[PDB]
Amino acid sequence: HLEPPPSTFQPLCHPLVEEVSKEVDGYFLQHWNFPNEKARKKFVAAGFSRVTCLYFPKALDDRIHFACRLLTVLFLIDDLLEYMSFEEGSAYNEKLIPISRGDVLPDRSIPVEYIIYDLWESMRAHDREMADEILEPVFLFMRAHTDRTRARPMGLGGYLEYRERDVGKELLAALMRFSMGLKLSPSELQRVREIDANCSKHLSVVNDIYSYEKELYTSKTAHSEGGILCTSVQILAQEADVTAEAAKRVLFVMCREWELRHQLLVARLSAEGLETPGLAAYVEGLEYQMSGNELWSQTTLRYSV
Amino acid sequence: LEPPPSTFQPLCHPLVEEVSKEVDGYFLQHWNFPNEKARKKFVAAGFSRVTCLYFPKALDDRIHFACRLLTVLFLIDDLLEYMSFEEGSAYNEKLIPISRGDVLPDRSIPVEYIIYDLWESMRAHDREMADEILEPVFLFMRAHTDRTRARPMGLGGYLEYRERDVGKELLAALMRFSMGLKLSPSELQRVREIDANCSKHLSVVNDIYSYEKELYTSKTAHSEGGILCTSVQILAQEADVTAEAAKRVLFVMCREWELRHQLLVARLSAEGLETPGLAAYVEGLEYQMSGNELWSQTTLRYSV
Ligand SMILES: [Mg+2]
Ligand SMILES: [Mg+2]
Ligand SMILES: [Mg+2]
Ligand SMILES: [Mg+2]
Numbered sequence: 172h173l174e175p176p177p178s179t180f181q182p183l184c185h186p187l188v189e190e191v192s193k194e195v196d197g198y199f200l201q202h203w204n205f206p207n208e209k210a211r212k213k214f215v216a217a218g219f220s221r222v223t224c225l226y227f228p229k230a231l232d233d234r235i236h237f238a239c240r241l242l243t244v245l246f247l248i249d250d251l252l253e254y255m256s257f258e259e260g261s262a263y264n265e266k267l268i269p270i271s272r273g274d275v276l277p278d279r280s281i282p283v284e285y286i287i288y289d290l291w292e293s294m295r296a297h298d299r300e301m302a303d304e305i306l307e308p309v310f311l312f313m314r315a316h317t318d319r320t321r322a323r324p325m326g327l328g329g330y331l332e333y334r335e336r337d338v339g340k341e342l343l344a345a346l347m348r349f350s351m352g353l354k355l356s357p358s359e360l361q362r363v364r365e366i367d368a369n370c371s372k373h374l375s376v377v378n379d380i381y382s383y384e385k386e387l388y389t390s391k392t393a394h395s396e397g398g399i400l401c402t403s404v405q406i407l408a409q410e411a412d413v414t415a416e417a418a419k420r421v422l423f424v425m426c427r428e429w430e431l432r433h434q435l436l437v438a439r440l441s442a443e444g445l446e447t448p449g450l451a452a453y454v455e456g457l458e459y460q461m462s463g464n465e466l467w468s469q470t471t472l473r474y475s476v
Numbered sequence: 477l478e479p480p481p482s483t484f485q486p487l488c489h490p491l492v493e494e495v496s497k498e499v500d501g502y503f504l505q506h507w508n509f510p511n512e513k514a515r516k517k518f519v520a521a522g523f524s525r526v527t528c529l530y531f532p533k534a535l536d537d538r539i540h541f542a543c544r545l546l547t548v549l550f551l552i553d554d555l556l557e558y559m560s561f562e563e564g565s566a567y568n569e570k571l572i573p574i575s576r577g578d579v580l581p582d583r584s585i586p587v588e589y590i591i592y593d594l595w596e597s598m599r600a601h602d603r604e605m606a607d608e609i610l611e612p613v614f615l616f617m618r619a620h621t622d623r624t625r626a627r628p629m630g631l632g633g634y635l636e637y638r639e640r641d642v643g644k645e646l647l648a649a650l651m652r653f654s655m656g657l658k659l660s661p662s663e664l665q666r667v668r669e670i671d672a673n674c675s676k677h678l679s680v681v682n683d684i685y686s687y688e689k690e691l692y693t694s695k696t697a698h699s700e701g702g703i704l705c706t707s708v709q710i711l712a713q714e715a716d717v718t719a720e721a722a723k724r725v726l727f728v729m730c731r732e733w734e735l736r737h738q739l740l741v742a743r744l745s746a747e748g749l750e751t752p753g754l755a756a757y758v759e760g761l762e763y764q765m766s767g768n769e770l771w772s773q774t775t776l777r778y779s780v
Contacts, residue, residue, distance in 0.1 A: 410635070411631065412736075428721040
């Protein structure tokens with residue numbers, strides 16, 4: 172068992188979590204091609220809409236389902252990439268990218284193609300400007316999964332710099348602002364770069380801590396490239412010469428330090444005359460992401476079995 | 477800074493006061509201290525106290541040997557921090573043949589005849605065990621002028637290097653010498669994994685408490701000789717957190733190494749591999765780790 176160190180962060184969940192979950196899970200159970208009944212049940216047990224609501228608890232009620240659909244299909248895609256090579260995985264992603272832009276019509280016989288297409292079409296229909304600001308961060312997220320730097324040795328420092336793209340920090344930032352209708356100026360976005368980077372490390376490592384057993388199993392049974400083990404747990408275990416479980420406890424303490432740094436960075440942003448009302452809502456949203464990511468990771472069957 | 481719970485209980489050599497006044501008295505008499513302020517600071521450090529905390533079960537007539545060796549190493553290393561890499565190298569390499577006894581010392585140069593008479597006295601008491609300390613000490617000395625210190629380092633690469641800079645090997649050889657504990661090469665091969673794990677504990681624990689002094693040294697002394705080479709600033713950089721934040725994380729990591737030590741020893745005992753000599757050895761390593769933490773917690777060397 173793993174006991175989480177004390178946190179001042181209060182995780183919040185979107186009030187419409189039960190409705191949207193039943194709705195979005197239902198959609199994918201109708202359209203997505205699951206290999207068997209076991210995969211369908213494991214899909215529901217994962218609670219991909221539940222993590223989305225924990226990520227963006229203050230999302231607008233008519234925009235939360237968009238986020239739940241996007242994160243869900245991205246989870247399904249990334250799980251498929253683990254059985255492919257870097258070459259096969261790259262081809263899979265790059266085929267869905269112009270479709271995501273809406274430049275290429277989808278193959279209605281291929282579930283992943285029209286699901287992706289209809290989603291982005293529906294999102295651009297609701298808010299064209301904000302939905303377009305999610306495209307490139309998503310593409311950055313997807314292309315990071317087939318980056319060949321995963322096949323090269325990394326220290327803790329270089330790993331965190333790479334994982335900011337692999338965890339989709341920028342993707343989650345754009346998705347959050349979209350779902351909340353929270354618009355920020357380029358001056359405001361640049362203003363909280365350091366807060367973003369600190370938040371990204373928290374999201375990545377917390378995920379690493381709870382998803383380690385799943386990824387460790389994948390690295391032994393799946394493809395040698397797509398299922399390769401790339402996590403801070405393994406890296407810290409190597410460099411410090413301790414068990415992976417020991418690395419988890421140490422990394423968890425480090426996460427609490429990043430939470431502290433988040434509070435100080437926000438305080439300094441407020442001490443200086445730089446904290447606009449939009450920024451206050453943004454950094455508060457980032458906190459929800461960090462605590463929301465932890466809560467879900469602690470409880471989902473995706474990681475416990 | 478509140479230390480996490482530890483099962484390691486520190487022990488101190490019962491003759492700590494007698495040997496302290498003897499060894500401190502020797503260096504105050506022979507070593508070239510610049511002024512009275514430096515002489516007081518030397519006594520305040522408690523270099524014989526940490527030695528008696530490192531090897532609490534050392535033999536009564538051999539504990540003073542260990543105190544002299546560690547004390548003169550502290551004095552030399554403090555001098556190196558005002559030198560360049562080249563100057564420090566020339567300084568160290570000059571004392572190495574003298575340590576072996578192949579070159580006579582300049583009797584007008586304190587460090588030379590102190591080093592010479594020390595090793596000569598140790599060989600007279602126990603020649604075989606004294607010779608087995610030479611190369612580990614030389615590895616320790618040469619690590620201080622290693623130019624890897626001026627180049628970017630990862631946490632893993634640092635711990636591998638710091639095993640030499642912390643002098644894990646010399647401390648092990650010194651412990652056995654002071655205790656008269658003789659172990660076969662095959663026995664020492666059994667505890668290689670335990671030694672490496674112990675080295676990380678000694679290094680990081682020292683890093684945590686000595687960080688403030690080393691930070692000040694890096695800002696005031698020589699840019700090369702006093703350069704900052706610690707896990708505290710390394711982990712801080714890799715994780716983009718403050719030094720105090722890294723300390724709290726590194727302290728947790730230290731307790732995990734204590735857990736691994738017990739696990740490795742238990743596994744060594746599960747198999748019929750823990751000989752009586754090894755049992756005293758692995759207990760001695762635990763004293764080194766617990767003793768190093770106690771001294772680092774309380775010494776004026778790190779607090780002021
Ligand atoms: Mg992955
Ligand atoms: Mg993961
Ligand atoms: Mg040093
Ligand atoms: Mg130190």
